[PDB]
Amino acid sequence: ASEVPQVVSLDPTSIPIEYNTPIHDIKVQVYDIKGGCNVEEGLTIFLVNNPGKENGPVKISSKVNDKQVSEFLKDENMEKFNVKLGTSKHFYMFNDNKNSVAVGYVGCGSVADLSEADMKRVVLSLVTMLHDNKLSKLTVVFEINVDKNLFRFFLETLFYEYMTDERFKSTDKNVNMEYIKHLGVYINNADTYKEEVEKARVYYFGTYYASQLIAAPSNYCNPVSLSNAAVELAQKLNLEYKILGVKELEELKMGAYLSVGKGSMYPNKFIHLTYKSKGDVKKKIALVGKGITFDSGGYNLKAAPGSMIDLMKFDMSGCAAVLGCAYCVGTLKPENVEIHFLSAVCENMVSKNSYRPGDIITASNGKTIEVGNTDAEGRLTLADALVYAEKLGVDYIVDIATLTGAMLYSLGTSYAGVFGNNEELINKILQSSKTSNEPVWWLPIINEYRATLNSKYADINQISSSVKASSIVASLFLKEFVQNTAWAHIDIAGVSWNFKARKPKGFGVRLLTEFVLND
Amino acid sequence: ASEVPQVVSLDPTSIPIEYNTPIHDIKVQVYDIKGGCNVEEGLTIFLVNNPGKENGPVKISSKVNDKQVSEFLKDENMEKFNVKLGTSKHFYMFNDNKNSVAVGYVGCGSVADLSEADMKRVVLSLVTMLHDNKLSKLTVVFEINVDKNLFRFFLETLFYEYMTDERFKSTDKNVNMEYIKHLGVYINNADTYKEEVEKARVYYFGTYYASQLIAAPSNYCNPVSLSNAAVELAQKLNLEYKILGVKELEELKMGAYLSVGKGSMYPNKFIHLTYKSKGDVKKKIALVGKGITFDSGGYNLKAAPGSMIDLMKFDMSGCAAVLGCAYCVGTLKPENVEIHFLSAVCENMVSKNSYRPGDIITASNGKTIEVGNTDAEGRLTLADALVYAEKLGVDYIVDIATLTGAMLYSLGTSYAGVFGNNEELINKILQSSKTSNEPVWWLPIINEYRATLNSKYADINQISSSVKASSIVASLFLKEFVQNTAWAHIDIAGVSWNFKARKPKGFGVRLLTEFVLNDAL
Amino acid sequence: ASEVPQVVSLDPTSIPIEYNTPIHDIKVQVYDIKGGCNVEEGLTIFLVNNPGKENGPVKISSKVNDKQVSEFLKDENMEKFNVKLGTSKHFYMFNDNKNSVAVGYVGCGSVADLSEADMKRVVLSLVTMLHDNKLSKLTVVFEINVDKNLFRFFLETLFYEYMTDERFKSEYIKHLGVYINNADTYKEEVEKARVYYFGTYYASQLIAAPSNYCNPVSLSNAAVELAQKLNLEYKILGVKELEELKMGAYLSVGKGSMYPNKFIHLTYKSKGDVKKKIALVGKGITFDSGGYNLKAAPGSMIDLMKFDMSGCAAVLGCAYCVGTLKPENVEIHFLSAVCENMVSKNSYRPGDIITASNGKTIEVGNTDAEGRLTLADALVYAEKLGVDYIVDIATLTGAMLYSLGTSYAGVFGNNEELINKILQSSKTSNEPVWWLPIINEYRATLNSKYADINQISSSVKASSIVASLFLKEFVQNTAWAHIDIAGVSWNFKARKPKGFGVRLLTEFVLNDAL
Ligand SMILES: O=C(CNc1ccccc1)N[C@@H](C(=O)NO)c1ccc(-c2cc(F)c(F)c(F)c2)cc1
Ligand SMILES: O=C(CNc1ccccc1)N[C@@H](C(=O)NO)c1ccc(-c2cc(F)c(F)c(F)c2)cc1
Ligand SMILES: O=C(CNc1ccccc1)N[C@@H](C(=O)NO)c1ccc(-c2cc(F)c(F)c(F)c2)cc1
Ligand code: NA
Ligand code: NA
Ligand SMILES: [Zn+2]
Ligand SMILES: [Zn+2]
Ligand SMILES: [Zn+2]
Ligand SMILES: [Zn+2]
Ligand SMILES: [Zn+2]
Ligand SMILES: [Zn+2]
């Protein structure tokens, strides 16, 4: 652990992190629907659809073990309500023991198989029922068909959206915010879904941990404090760790990564965590996250309208996903694998000491690079991280990065893009996207654009002379720093931030963990 | 001379410079064309035109001392080819010694007298024939008429365009790059052209030396490393030299120049080299180059669309031209002159320490200046350099500077602009432009605009309140720092960088050298 | 005369023109300073400098034949005032006859020879006193040195700046006295100055007239009226004739306007043998919206674009001076392809390929580069006349503001002798111009993939030079010059036209052409 430099004594010296969240105190119980539902304290919510009948009526099919509640939920009373996706109603009544109970439903539409986006809308409606209501228990009755992965995603998303991050509130903490202590779930074939519960709780926290790092502003979350947080995480999980400082980075000749950080008051810190299975290692994987804790753009300052310099604390979202994956992997302990979690962390600032547009810098593999724009800093840091990763001798290198704003014009805010030099690895990532329910789309590395990276003076240009397809150009540049290892690159610039809710998504934690686990 | 400060240990501490270039290893021989051409080895190229005939046929006039090549070059076999400017052809054949030779031509058009731009196109086509062909020797046969200056220009341009700067390549060096070892030239009245060969070689390196400094990026070429390179050049040439550091600049009260450099991690360095002739000194000249090794714009940051911040390593092109001229002058050693080569070198950066828009700063002649835009920094450094130059007691002061982007809208990328306070000196610059074949156009210093530099609080404003003709306004500002000396100002902002080829031109080395040489004779 | 189309009945159908101005009623007398200055009525202003002593004191050299005013003008009183250029004071007092007179000075700085810009500043300070005092007479005493041309420029500028254009709103002195050393040599400049003033003011009236008043129909109608008043030959070519002449570049620009294109051709021809023939071509865009390349960028000044016919205006003001002064042995053609560049379903588009009257196909790269298209067909028309010189004058390129600015126009040409004649006309008219090059290396950037030539360059930012290269393609074998007045036409500080070019072109015709 290194000391965080301060300008004034009021500058923070660590990222506040909540490990023991209220979600972790919730006791989860799963019951089979065949035994009927007991309707007692708290709120009991039925998830109901009506296939093929758009905005069709609500009908409750499950057996309910209360005559009063069964009478309330008969078809004649329920048919006045409809299943329109995201719609909900609350019910009040006295049960057979003369206790008042609260019941309701969330509409799940008319399409038998819900997409991750549909299921998220269902969860958001459920969370509105949890907020502003002091409940000790929620019970959820599944009258829809979900596979095991989608059941886990429901739980992960519920936990994540319910959790409210108050680390930076002082005088404006929500004085009414209370969390349930119990969650009941009724589902058909419950025994087959029970193994998903604790996996969902792990995936939730890896994702929420990533969100905590992302949302932490750049005065709290800087290269020293972020690498310190990684050390503490490794200590908690018994992972091996190494933080490389400037002197070691100079010895490794990491000139592209070091140049980006020249202008910052925070020394560069390179994170290397390692998980190794106890048994024979059958696969070795390097996960590389882009870790720019604030991106001002440098001398190519983000001053253009719409460049959103105020959100650029999120430019370490890739590092956060890799560290959240380390939480999940260190918790779940997969066998037969060795995983390296890597991030070349730095901050891109304006200073007398900053690198300049036009500088020619030398990466750790000897390639000279002409810098065309100091705001294309992520690919420079990743170049040196990829050289480092390939020296580890791994089977797969996967990097994840908020690399190019063009991602918003190609895939938008819902799907990440994956690029790579190896179809088998790309297909493994796409399969992990399916089982994590974090959507990714394969995009091409178009070799015809490579000539636009030819530099008159250096071995290569950082940016293209003509091509505006920057996500593809960036991938061509990165490809030059992986010589003979299967490699894939996930550009999460469009999917990292939830603009409607003004908070991170923690995108990539579950994708990467499913990738490690399914291998 | 001074230690280059570093942020990380990987930051470079000197500019790589190649002094012996492959061009210098080319042995050049000039033969009179009257004796006929020998065609034995390598590539032999005829420079051919057809005066008055639009796109007329190739017709070879020279005698060729080989029966086989003469048969190939007969009019009947050449009439399928035309002399269109820049067109070229290659021929393969066996000579009388049964050795395979390569022969060809480059078309020089139908207009007997070629401009500098025309000759450049001819040379560029020649260079394409040298690339991707591993040849030991090139022979050029002039079947066009060129004067001595244009023959020298041909060689200088050939040398400059042929040379490839690989200083910053490591893993991507051209594995196939081979240079000729011999250059043969056949020309009429060869004895009068032989003296141009070594002059062309000197002018080539002065221009290529300037290009090397310009193309070197701002992490390599900073105020300390550039002034160190100037000392090393002065030492090799036996020039007197002095580098003024911050404490001496403070004692000289160089407050405009020092303000520009406040925001940089590199201390300001003022270059002063001197060439002095052995005999009676009849003329004393100060050459002043703008030397901003990187121009971020300062707090008036180059953030507007079209502001090319990524190219601003070229903002010391004027300094580079002056040092390239020092090489040529120190090598050719003219008589009757003393030449001072000056540059107020610094870097324009954004920092807690930078000067601010609105600051009022005091120049070394006591004039107070209101800073209106920190990106108008060149005229500030030049103001103090001009005060220094006039204190030397010279006959002429000439400054050269990448000063105003408006130059691209006035003269464009081919012609530099010259402004000045003295008609005789302006005419001497124009004559040097003609004999150097570096084009310059005289532009006016329009005194009506001077009132727009009136400041409410300081003695003068740095920038105009209303006038958009910024090349003229900048000249008017500079004019305030020359009190009673003949002075001219050459704005090379539009001509310094070759946008098509993505490389410097080294513009001004030959212009300034011709200026010195013509005034010395 | 053609009928001006209207959208509503309130749209104007002619340009109001004032021919008889109050300036024409001023009686001018020039007296030699030797013998002393009489100070009897009105306002008397001394033009005074102080060479070497910058902002030095005012000192009056002339004898004044009034004892009271002489006391006022004593060195001890005048040294409280200084000669900083444009500074002025004037006081009211009783002269020896107990008549109220006003006496004062305008500072002329510390340089002995005033430039045209310095003299404008002097005149502006003089006019400020004329606008703020009810006066029957002004007397100006020259204690500075002016040559004959600068003296005439002084009078022209005084008349022009003093005149106030009130045509769109809903007392002048009657006498001007001038005391100057060697007065007899200056007397012939007075009525020349009055002619040059009105030609310049006439051009100013056409320029300042808004585009609803001054459109292609009403401007060509005004040109006919001028020709009739001056006994010039005249011809207005309409769309049917323009189509028969195949002027496809000019007609394309006007396609989107509600006003039909009108080509003005006036002719002055000397009574004696014609020894020199000259065509003067003025750009006449009565409003330049930019077309589909609309003037929407910050700083594109769409609200000022009524001035895009300033070249035509100068050519017509020149026709006034020439028809009035009647030079011998010359025939002069005054030409303008007048139209309006508008946005409509009917406009030409960026990318259109159009065919000029000499058969050249042109690829339109920007509809706001419309002036060179109209000038292209005008130059083909001019060369068919068989003239010795073609001079065009045009508000062509905004790049002039970045090259020479608002004070000097640029001249380009294909013939050095003709360029030097224009520069000499600039010296004697005191309308400054600077010679700029036509750089042949840029010509390749006008090579079009599909048409014979591009209208604009894709790569070269030296737009004034590229525009000249384009125009040169439409002059085959005639001495030709092109004067770009885009930067000098409008006086931004005073919010009015300059009428730039009228006097320059007249001096060229009178003195330098033949
Ligand atoms: O890609 C570029 C330059 N071209 C470009 C920029 C913006 C839009 C289209 C093209 N610059 C990147 C950078 O600075 N990398 O270091 C960058 C810039 C922006 C975002 C981002 C993230 C978000 F969440 C957004 F909602 C968003 F609009 C943009 C990510 C990376
Ligand atoms: O003139 C200005 C104000 N801006 C401006 C105005 C009008 C037109 C263009 C820019 N700023 C100067 C500066 O910053 N001086 O210190 C400067 C700025 C740019 C270039 C340059 C060089 C080139 F080779 C170019 F191709 C180019 F477009 C611009 C030179 C000097
Ligand atoms: O030159 C162009 C191309 N654009 C452009 C390029 C470089 C710089 C500025 C504009 N467009 C011309 C046009 O539209 N011709 O038809 C045009 C445009 C503007 C003015 C004008 C007149 C004034 F009096 C001004 F004060 C002024 F700022 C501009 C004249 C001609
Ligand atoms: Na953060
Ligand atoms: Na450089
Ligand atoms: Zn970034
Ligand atoms: Zn960036
Ligand atoms: Zn600069
Ligand atoms: Zn600048
Ligand atoms: Zn226009
Ligand atoms: Zn126009």
UniProtKB/Swiss-Prot annotation, chain B:
Reactions accelerated catalytically: Release of an N-terminal amino acid, Xaa-|-Yaa-, in which Xaa is preferably Leu, but may be other amino acids including Pro although not Arg or Lys, and Yaa may be Pro. Amino acid amides and methyl esters are also readily hydrolyzed, but rates on arylamides are exceedingly low; L-cysteinylglycine + H2O = L-cysteine + glycine
Cofactor field: Zn(2+)
Family annotation (Pfam families): Peptidase_M17
One Gene Ontology cellular component: cytoplasm
Location in the cell: Cytoplasm
Keyword Hydrolase recorded: yes
Any GO BP annotation: proteolysis
Sites where the protein binds Zn(2+) 2: 290, 295, 315, 377
Site (Essential for hexamer stabilization): 302
UniProt EC number: 3.4.11.1, 3.4.13.-
Record-annotated active site: 302, 379
pH dependence of function: Optimum pH is 8.5. Active between pH 7 and 11. Optimum pH is 8 for the cleavage of the Cys-Gly dipeptide.
Chain positions covered by the region annotation L13 loop: 300-317
Residues given in the record as Zn(2+) 3 binding sites: 310, 312, 315
Keywords associated with the record: Aminopeptidase, Cytoplasm, Dipeptidase, Hydrolase, Metal-binding, Protease, Zinc
Regulation: Oligomerization is required for catalytic activity and is metal-dependent. The type of metal that binds the 2 metal binding sites influences catalytic activity and substrate specificity. In vitro, activated by Co(2+), Mn(2+), Ni(2+), Mg(2+) and Zn(2+) with decreasing strength. Occupancy of the site 2 is essential and sufficient for activating the enzyme but occupation of the 2 sites is necessary for full catalytic activity. Inhibited by fungal metabolite bestatin. Inhibited by Phe-Naphthyl (PNAP).
Gene Ontology molecular function terms on file: carboxypeptidase activity; identical protein binding; manganese ion binding; metal ion binding; metalloaminopeptidase activity; metallodipeptidase activity; peptidase activity; zinc ion binding
Chain residues that bind Zn(2+) 1: 295, 375, 377
Domain notes: The L13 loop movement regulates the transition between active and inactive conformations by repositioning Lys-302, which, in turn, mediates the rearrangement of the binuclear metal center.
Role description: Aminopeptidase which preferentially cleaves leucine residues from the N-terminus of peptides. Also, has some activity towards tryptophan and methionine and to a lesser extent towards phenylalanine. Has very low activity or no activity towards the other amino acids. In addition, cleaves the Cys-Gly dipeptide, probably as part of the glutathione regulation pathway; cleavage only occurs in the presence of Mn(2+).
Protein name (database record): Leucine aminopeptidase
The species this protein was found in: Plasmodium falciparum (isolate 3D7)
Gene field: LAP
UniProtKB/Swiss-Prot annotation, chain C:
Database matches in PROSITE patterns: CYTOSOL_AP
Effect of residue 442 to A: Loss of catalytic activity and impairs oligomerization
Top-level taxon of origin: Eukaryota
Annotated Zn(2+) 2 binding sites: 283, 288, 308, 370
InterPro entries (alphabetical): Leucine_aapep/pepB (IPR011356), Macro_dom-like (IPR043472), Peptidase_M17_C (IPR000819), Peptidase_M17_leu_NH2_pept (IPR023042)
Cofactor(s) needed for function: Zn(2+)
Signal peptide: none
Site feature (Essential for hexamer stabilization) residues: 295
Binding site for Zn(2+) 1: 288, 368, 370
Keywords: Aminopeptidase, Cytoplasm, Dipeptidase, Hydrolase, Metal-binding, Protease, Zinc
Binding positions (Zn(2+) 3): 303, 305, 308
Function: Aminopeptidase which preferentially cleaves leucine residues from the N-terminus of peptides. Also, has some activity towards tryptophan and methionine and to a lesser extent towards phenylalanine. Has very low activity or no activity towards the other amino acids. In addition, cleaves the Cys-Gly dipeptide, probably as part of the glutathione regulation pathway; cleavage only occurs in the presence of Mn(2+).
Domain remarks in the Swiss-Prot or TrEMBL record: The L13 loop movement regulates the transition between active and inactive conformations by repositioning Lys-295, which, in turn, mediates the rearrangement of the binuclear metal center.
Protein name in the entry: Leucine aminopeptidase
Organism, as annotated: Plasmodium falciparum (isolate 3D7)
Gene: LAP
